[PDB]
Amino acid sequence: AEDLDYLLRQYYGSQGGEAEVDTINSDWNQYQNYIDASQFMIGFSFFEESASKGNLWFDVNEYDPNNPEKGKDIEGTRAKKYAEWQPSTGGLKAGIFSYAIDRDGVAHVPSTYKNRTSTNLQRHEVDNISHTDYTVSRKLKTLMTEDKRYDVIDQKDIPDPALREQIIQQVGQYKGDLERYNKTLVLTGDKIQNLKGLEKLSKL
């Protein structure tokens, strides 16, 4: 862990609980002792062609017979959930990743095919191969970069430039890190005049 740049945790399909992220939060509770949240990345999977029971995750929308473009909508998807999801502790996550990005935009096979198998194969329109615009990938990236938590720490948070510098180096550079950081902060040196903004480190 000490030598990793990123850990990429694949969390395809439901991970338990009402909000389907129990396993993610429980796992992070352990992961955080070994890596920073700035190194942590969670993944969903696109719908692969001719996938049978054992590889059907429903991380993107199902086929809709009246809206060919439903696979490209990220609304109410586990993909959007993961983009939005953040750790309780440590800080904001590094980001998300997708499996089989070459299938970006293809709708999932309907729930009715949930138990299809290699022998007992019931194929569907969505098992066909198609060119992709990477529409979902760009929506998920834009979503995360437009999230206000990833706004940088400014003088409205920590006025003193000397204190702001040190907090950034130790906890992170985002507003949403302050809320979450739950380790040690060592403030040093004669440049710090006042400690305003330090109250924002609620979990320190």
Binding site: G13, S14, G54, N115
Partner: protein
């Protein structure tokens, strides 16, 4: 959708006082999405709540198995009471009900005969001690070997075979080093069946 399998107790466990027999109920192909599996157990249509459900066991990606084990009373099983297992789940249209009981029919007492190695086998480093059990009904039976009070464990037993008179027979074949046979050690063939007194007999086999 989820399937159900209901296995009976091991015949030795129903017949031996040292053992506790169990009916086992297995639910396979349970989805990750709707995981709650409720079991209800019935003994002659009478609900029993003493069952013991083991936690789920991922067989392959996002598919689990759930086992429930009900301890049974030796008498209840041997008196041919019905054991019903009822499974409930969200991914079921209606609950699933499976029932098992003991094989019915006029019991017949096994006849146990031990047979020594063939003269021809004595040219080999290991020889075959044989135990014939014949004329028993029903086919639920258990055969073990022993020597000097310790269990002998290098044996294989045939499945029961239907004989021409409607009863069953089988052979068990304990393999021992010739040295141990020639030195005159005694070997025991233990047979366990519901039609024996105390569900037990022992026949001995040593060199003549």
């Amino acid at each position: 959708g989820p399937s159900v399998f209901l296995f009976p107790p091991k015949p030795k466990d129903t017949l031996m006082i040292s053992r506790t027999p169990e009916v086992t109920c297995v639910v396979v192909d349970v989805s990750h999405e709707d995981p709650e599996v409720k079991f209800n157990w019935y003994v002659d249509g009478v609900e029993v709540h003493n069952a013991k459900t083991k936690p789920r066991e991922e067989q392959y990606n996002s598919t689990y198995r759930v086992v429930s084990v009900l301890t049974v009373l030796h008498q209840d099983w041997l008196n041919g009471k019905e054991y019903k297992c009822k499974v409930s789940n969200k991914a079921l249209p209606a609950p699933i009900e499976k029932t098992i009981s003991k094989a019915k029919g006029q019991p017949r007492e096994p006849q146990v005969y031990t047979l020594p190695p063939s003269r021809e086998e004595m040219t080999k480093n290991q020889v075959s001690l044989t135990c014939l059990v014949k004329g028993f009904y029903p086919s639920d039976i258990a055969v073990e070997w022993a020597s000097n009070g310790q269990p002998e464990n290098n044996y294989k037993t045939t499945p029961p075979v239907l004989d021409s008179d409607g009863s069953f027979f089988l052979y068990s074949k304990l393999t021992v080093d010739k040295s141990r046979w020639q030195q005159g050690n005694v070997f025991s063939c233990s047979v366990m069946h519901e039609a024996l007194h105390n569900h037990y007999t022992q026949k001995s086999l040593s060199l003549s």
